[PDB]
Amino acid sequence: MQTPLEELYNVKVERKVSQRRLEELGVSRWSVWKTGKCKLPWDWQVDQLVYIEEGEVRVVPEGSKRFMQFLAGDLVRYPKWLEADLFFNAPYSERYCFKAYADD
Amino acid sequence: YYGLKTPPYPLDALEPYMSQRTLEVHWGKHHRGYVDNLNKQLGKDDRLYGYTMEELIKATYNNGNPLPEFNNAAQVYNHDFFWESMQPGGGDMPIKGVLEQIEKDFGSFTNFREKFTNAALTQFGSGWVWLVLKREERRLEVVKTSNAINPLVWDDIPIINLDVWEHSYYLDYKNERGKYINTFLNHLVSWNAAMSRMARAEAFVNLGEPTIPIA
Amino acid sequence: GFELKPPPYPLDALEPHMSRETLDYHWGKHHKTYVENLNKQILEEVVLLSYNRGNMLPAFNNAAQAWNHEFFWESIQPGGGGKPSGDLLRLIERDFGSFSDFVERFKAAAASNFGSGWTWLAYKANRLDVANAVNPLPKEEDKKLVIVKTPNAVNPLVWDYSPLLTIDTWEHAYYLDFENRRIEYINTFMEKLVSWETVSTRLESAMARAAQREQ
Amino acid sequence: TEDEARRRNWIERGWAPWEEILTPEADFARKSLNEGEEVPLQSPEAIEAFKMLRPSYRKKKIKEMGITEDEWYAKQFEIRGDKPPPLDTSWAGPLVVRQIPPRDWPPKGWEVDRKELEFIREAHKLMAERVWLEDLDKDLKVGEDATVDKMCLERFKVFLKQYNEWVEANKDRLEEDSYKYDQDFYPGRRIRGKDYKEGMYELPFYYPGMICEGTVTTLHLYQGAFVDIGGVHEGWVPIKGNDWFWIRHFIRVGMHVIVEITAKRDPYRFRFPLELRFVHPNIDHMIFNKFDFPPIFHRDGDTNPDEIRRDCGRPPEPRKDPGSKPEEEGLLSDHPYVDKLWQLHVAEQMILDDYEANPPKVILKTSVKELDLEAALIERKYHKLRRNIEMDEYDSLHWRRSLEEREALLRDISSRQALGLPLEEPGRYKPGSFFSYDDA
Amino acid sequence: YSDSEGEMHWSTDVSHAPEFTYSNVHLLPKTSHLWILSGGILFSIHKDQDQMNIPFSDLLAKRRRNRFLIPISVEIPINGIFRRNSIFAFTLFPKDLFREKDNIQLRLVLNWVRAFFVEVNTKGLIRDFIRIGLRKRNNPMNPFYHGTIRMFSLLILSSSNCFRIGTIKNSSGPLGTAIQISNFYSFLPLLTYNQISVIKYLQLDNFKYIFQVIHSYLIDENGRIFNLDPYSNLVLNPFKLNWYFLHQNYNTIISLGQFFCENVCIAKKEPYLKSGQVLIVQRDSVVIRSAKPYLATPGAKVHGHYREILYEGDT
Ligand SMILES: [Fe+3]
Ligand SMILES: [Fe+3]
């Protein structure tokens, strides 16, 4: 359809995050997750903040024919109750943090 | 952007049941702070701007995973609805169609009063107590919600509101919430406001019965 | 039969930071009612049992609040504030960078806690009751300090955390002294009231609790 | 009894005694068959119906009544039965309005001066000002004092300047999209072609809360009344089913009405982008059948049902409840990339073996350029292996990710249970009736 | 039998109560006509009046969740299918650091399954394997590589069953945004009452403000109140910014929903009408939903409740 997937699925993105915002979030203390070329299905049970440090991921929501692309330097907030397949085609590295209600 | 709407009465008009100092802090600080915080958020999101107030509350509620703007947007509506729910020389009993609907949906006004009181006494922590008109069931109900939640998020039409956040009664009653609830029902609740809100709600619910031909 | 213990200081000893009127109502009315209602429905074991893995039983609100307030009174002293030392200062700098950074994050969490609730400094050494939840090779940095916010009566005990410090952000805790100004109440708490020697003492028990589990 | 069943058919099944305009043959059939099979017709209705079987008799009957043939042809299309009580619409005080720019200006993807926009947006705080009927007399401006130049409309005029700039730059594109997406015209679609006139209001000119004067142009038995409110899209008042049985006496094509905008929606997704209600005449007491949701289009690019329902406000597709709590399930530690590492591990080991020796089926091609043979050969000459260690460290990262989600989930559960917030996505998970080696 | 698929309608002369409580059979006390209105599912997006534009050596092995690979002699059944408590082989795996809970469990007897071959190839080298295996995260295409719904039961309405039978000047448009009147307590103004609602919901102090005709006031951005002529109906055009008069001061032959027979005459100079129900009424045309009447005599039995869907060939 005409509406982008990020708007439909409430995937908040902050492409090209400044270093000041990273330190406000305390990204340097976040855990590290990395992968190579693979496919990851996941259903988010809580909100997750992801800061991509290397590579890119293409996110295909359940039943979708389109994808959302996030690149290194982007800060992504995956919403609670989201079901999607994450696709990687090259080395990928990220720092993540799961957020409960309130929190951040 | 939304302005801070004055209550429909002067701040000392609810004395001695609700003190002037309570109105000055509750409206002048709490309600004002909600409006100011909401306006800052709306100035950064053009999509949330352009929603109506009812649409904004439902959209920011996000089907049970509220967005950061929900608390401010919900609270500004809740307090505006709350000031209009009270009037000088209020209380006693409703009349005309409000009384008839209450007697139909609760059995009597006494049954409604106990249900409203028990909902307000048993709401733990901050929250609100509502007399609502159910859209699907076409009847009145008593509903209690926590924090900023209001019945608009479930497509219900509020009729009467009571704030049971501690900041609304602690200066005048301290821990005696029961006295605050009893005073609200006896001297403050505006049944005139309920008459007009039911009239506005009748444009969407139609609490009457159809005229069916014998043919 | 649980009993209401008095604060470990005279009710006038927190002046002018916390008035006697606040203590007369916070301890003499709110905390007293929680214990009285709990005894009619029948402490750490009671809180875990009544939590019921999230499907809270009727006794949980009284039991958890009674524990929370007793924990709250021990968290402050008439000559508090300042800085901690010993192993607590080492852990704070390890997990927050510096003590100044920790204070800013703790104050912000207490300020942003919407509605009634508590803000906690806790020692996170929890174990999960699910399968494949044991780390074969612990790194010893997994037992860290965290700042967590809870709503209403919830406390970190229900997730098997070890609380070290709390501040009551229910409006009844500060409304008689600061009205809506929760920021000033939080700032006063961290500069004049907080008892770091009690927090250090609670850290030793939490460390010994984890040590006993590891053996 | 035959009073509750009739009421049940009206309310539950939408029955109404709609008029049946019968031919003389059909009218004779129903009047004569009530008497018998082959009997002398006795009732005056059947006797008259027998006479009416000849159009020559009808013409003689018409002339004796002094009316024309076409008037008689129109008298058979008349509503039978009783009439509803006539409407009595009372005004709740005077109609007081402001000229407030729509909150949703400007449209998405259109750039305007943000300084002018903030000047425009100042008027949105005027809704908070209180007006009392006891006060619309003290300083009322009339006659020569109420000319347009005397009024302060500066913030609305800046909106008009931006609106006209947007119209002149997007008018042709919007009409082109109408032809691309909508094959045929229908009330609620964009007026195009010869029917379009310059000066018609575009959708961003309207906003909920506005009061409009318009004329009724179309009545639909299953949809409602469509009102021309001076725009390129007609407004829509939802009326359907039995309600039209009485409402048809008052809502007629071509009559002037006063309407209020209750919702404005995207015309690509929703059939009727402008939703209205009648202000004058007031027919709120006559409307009983309501639309659960506004009707939408199912278009070519709509292949995912979950995306469609998010574009509108419709519930998710329900599913059977799993009957298991997510917070009680075992953690996941199998990193999806481990299966790829295993293939690379096997490829390196078989290449090393060849180096030594000669210095239902699924086939997995492996490239030599994605293998690290320099480290493998050193490990081979030195002698789990490095690749096996590499699989465990990827598993540890995945296990840590699962642990942190579960810990956040446990806190999230306690907060939601205390505040009465849903644990599962609402609408999802409808209930029933809705549809050893290791130790050895 | 019904000649076409559609929904049943009767106007009069059919008993609304069924002959028996359980049955769907209705009697006719009088002669009547029974009409079959012609007509052509996710239930979360397909709703009433939607428009459908589209049709409806152990180091080489591996152990994972409910699966494992093997480079002890392996005995596989003929069909390659394992049942519960089946022998497949009479330290297999690298003993991973983490082991997820699996439905499958070893004992070598498989207990809790399909078996197939896995082959890894690189530069003319082959190594075969035996793969024995059994919420979104539990999953065991690559982005890098007409008709209108009628619901109440679904029918499709389209062109196969619906057919057509063929101051400044006042203009329709917005008058402005109605503001809240504090006397009436409502954030969105009531504007008007009807006959029923004025008796139920009108406050005593507001009787003085009920008006039979419309009165128009304008508030500018500074808070001044304008009326121009407080005894007529004058409003401001928001686009042209001028005053104009309202149309009224607000103090056809064919009717919607009527049923027609196959040769009814509307006028001498007009073609005869077709049978059906008036679905759409416009200024100079009417859209008809095709329907077929059936004549029934007293004592006949109707098979189906009102609006019950009948398929072609049904009694
Ligand atoms: Fe409040
Ligand atoms: Fe407290």
How far is ligand 1, taken at its centre, from the CA of residue B168, in Å? 6
Q: Give the three-state DSSP class for E62.
A: strand
Q: Is D422 in Cβ contact with B46 (below 8 Å)? A: no
How far is ligand 1, taken at its centre, from the CA of residue D235, in Å? 39
Phi, psi of A46 (to 5 degrees): -140, 165
How far is ligand 1, taken at its centre, from the CA of residue B28, in Å? 11
CA distance C194 to C186: 10
Q: Specify the DSSP element, H or E, that contains E157.
A: strand E154-157
Angle, CA E30 vertex, CA E25 and CA E32 arms, to 5°: 75
CA distance B209 to B197: 20
For residues E178 and D97, the answer to whether their CB atoms sit within 8 Å is yes
Report DSSP state, residue D85: P
CA distance E182 to B84: 9
How far is ligand 1, taken at its centre, from the CA of residue B170, in Å? 11
Nearest-CA residue of chain D relative to C116? D419
CB atoms within 10 A of CB E253: 13
- Whether the ω angle into residue D238 lies within 30 degrees of 0, i.e. cis, is no
Instruction: Say which residues have a Cβ less than 8 Å from residue D182's Cβ, sequence separation at least 6.
Output: D189, D190
Calculate the CA A65 to chain-centre distance.
19
Nearest-CA residue of chain B relative to D4? B212
Sheet order of strands, D297-298 included: D297-298, E51-52, E148-151, E154-157
- Whether the ω angle into residue D106 lies within 30 degrees of 0, i.e. cis, is yes
Nearest to E142 among A42, A62, A87 (CB): A87
In E220-282, DSSP assigns E strands to 225-228, 234-237, 242-245, 259-260, 276-281
Residue D370 Cα distances to C37, D385, D388, D395, angstroms:
69, 18, 17, 21
User: After which residues are there C–N gaps above 2.5 Å in chain B?
Assistant: none
Residue D181 Cα distances to D174, D178, D301, D343, angstroms:
11, 5, 11, 49
Sheet order of strands, E86-87 included: E86-87, E109-111, E105-106
CA distance D137 to E227: 10
Does B210 touch chain D if contact means CB atoms closer than 8 Å?
yes
The pairing of strands E225-228 and D140-142 is: parallel
CA distance C173 to C155: 17
Ligand in closest contact with the CA of B165: 1
Calculate the CA A7 to chain-centre distance.
14
Resolution (A): 2.5
Would you tell me which residues 18-57 of chain B have a C-beta closer than 8 angstroms to some C-beta of chain D?
46-47, 49-52
DSSP D185-249: --TTSPP-GGG--TTPBPGGG--TTEEEEEEEEEEETTTEEEEE-SBSS-EEEE--TTHHHHHTT
Q: Residues of D with CB below 8 A from C151's CB?
A: 415, 418-419
CA distance C27 to C44: 20
Nearest-CA residue of chain D relative to B146? D419
Nearest to E177 among D98, D133, D279 (CB): D98
Nearest to E267 among D70, D283, D334 (CB): D70
How far is ligand 2, taken at its centre, from the CA of residue D358, in Å? 80
Does B1 touch chain D if contact means CB atoms closer than 8 Å?
yes
For residues D239 and D276, the answer to whether their CB atoms sit within 8 Å is no
CA distance D252 to C167: 67
Ligand in closest contact with the CA of C118: 2
How far is ligand 2, taken at its centre, from the CA of residue E165, in Å? 75
Experimental technique of record: cryo-EM
Q: Which burial class, exposed, middle or buried, applies to D371 when counting CB atoms under 10 A from its CB (0-12, 13-18, 19+)?
A: middle
Which chains contact A through at least 3 pairs of Cβ atoms less than 8 Å apart?
B, C, D, E
For residues D221 and D240, the answer to whether their CB atoms sit within 8 Å is yes
Q: Residues of A with CB below 8 A from E137's CB?
A: 41-43
Calculate the CA B155 to chain-centre distance.
14
Nearest to A100 among D269, D412, D424 (CB): D412
Q: Is C113 in Cβ contact with A103 (below 8 Å)? A: no
For residues E99 and E66, the answer to whether their CB atoms sit within 8 Å is no
Q: Residues of E with CB below 8 A from B198's CB?
A: 200-201
Nearest-CA residue of chain D relative to E29? D34
